[PDB]
Design a protein around this ligand. Structure first.
Ligand code: NI
Ligand code: NI
Ligand code: NI
Lengths: 168, 168, 168
């Protein structure tokens, strides 16, 4: 199923996700729906809290052929280093982009779709995406890193997008 | 979560649902998402196959205040009698309505959200909704009861609607 | 403010009202205008749909000293028994009256003007008034209970009345 993606300024985007207790068939359905939603909306990452499911589940695909599914359940950041920034987008802040300070290199531990633990070292685009998605799970958005004026301009542009999408 | 509702002429609307093996937390999550979707779309009934979940699950609320949740899992029709018809709508055939022949009274057995069996005798609006929703589960739409030329009128109306609502 | 009361054969009288989401200051202004309208026209009950406001709000005051106000928001009928009938009037059917079958005794649950829930058992005139007003909210009029010939006659009476009303 394709789930509805929340937009700012929805306050559900600010909730802190709980850890997944057990990777069972219910969790695997959520993971599969989240991929289906992410590809439908043409994103490269999606966190459960964006679809109003407040558990620590992220899906990512940064591949050119869109055939490289990465699942992070209960991710934990072990190490990071360096600093970078790319103009980031977000399905919850549609059509807006802004440079945000990130670590350049990241090492994480997570469970996969089978609930098996794995470690992953990432740099480049992948490292940035993982950090962006992990921020969601604690209720943080990329606009939070920006000045109060930039934050206001972004909120306003999104509220205008959505007015028109809703046209009676 | 709010799920996407399929529209004609999607072929997945014609699939025959499988019975629910076990009413567990996964099924209860589906039921809760289905209610959330139905209220969001302002419908009075929704079948699982309309949100691309091909299991025998129906949610209904025909109440005035929208606070009377009825769940039918693995419904079976035990008895029916009489004949009626109102102008029926459907979230999968947006904004179209047509009078369809139905039984006036219906007696069904089903499992509730806890997986407990129950029997229900219905007439009036409820009886009509139950039959409409049970039709979905075997891949049948209300337009199937109409002449080829009304079916063609309805399919065109809906396609115009969707096309001319789809800006990127 | 005094609102305009719709007359038959206005089709807005046949719309089904939505439940009130939240009893806030806007809803409380509507309630106050509805009372002001009802007293102005000298009625004993008024439903929101009669003034082209399609939410589940009803005001009733049978008192002589216009000082026993009753507000029903999102009413629900819990129990009914018996059968009665008096010659009912309606501000939407100017100057016409007809005996209509009603339940004699009625038990309802509703929200008051503050949005606090309450239960009310009624008989006599109040019970009939409550049923009459609850009908308005699902688009029913008292003339709907009468023969086709009686209905046509009432429609004509009212149209003749409003025809004279407007003069130029
Ligand atoms: Ni994001
Ligand atoms: Ni339907
Ligand atoms: Ni009336």
């Amino acid at each position: 199923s394709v789930l509805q993606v929340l937009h700012i300024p929805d306050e559900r985007l600010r909730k802190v996700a709980k850890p997944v207790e057990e990777v069972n068939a219910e969790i695997q359905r959520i993971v599969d729906d989240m991929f289906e939603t992410m590809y439908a909306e043409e994103g490269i990452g999606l966190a459960a809290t964006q679809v109003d499911i407040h558990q620590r589940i992220i899906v990512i695909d940064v591949s050119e052929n869109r055939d490289e599914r990465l699942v992070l359940i209960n991710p934990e950041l072990l190490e990071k280093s360096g600093e970078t920034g790319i103009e980031e987008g977000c399905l919850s802040i549609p059509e807006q982009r802004a440079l945000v300070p990130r670590a350049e290199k990241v090492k994480i531990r997570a469970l996969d779709r089978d609930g098996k633990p794995f470690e992953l070292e990432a740099d480049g685009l992948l490292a940035i995406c993982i950090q962006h998605e992990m921020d969601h799970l604690v209720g943080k958005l990329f606009m939070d890193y920006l000045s109060p004026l930039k934050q206001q301009r972004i909120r306003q542009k999104v509220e205008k997008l959505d007015r028109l999408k809703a046209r009676a």
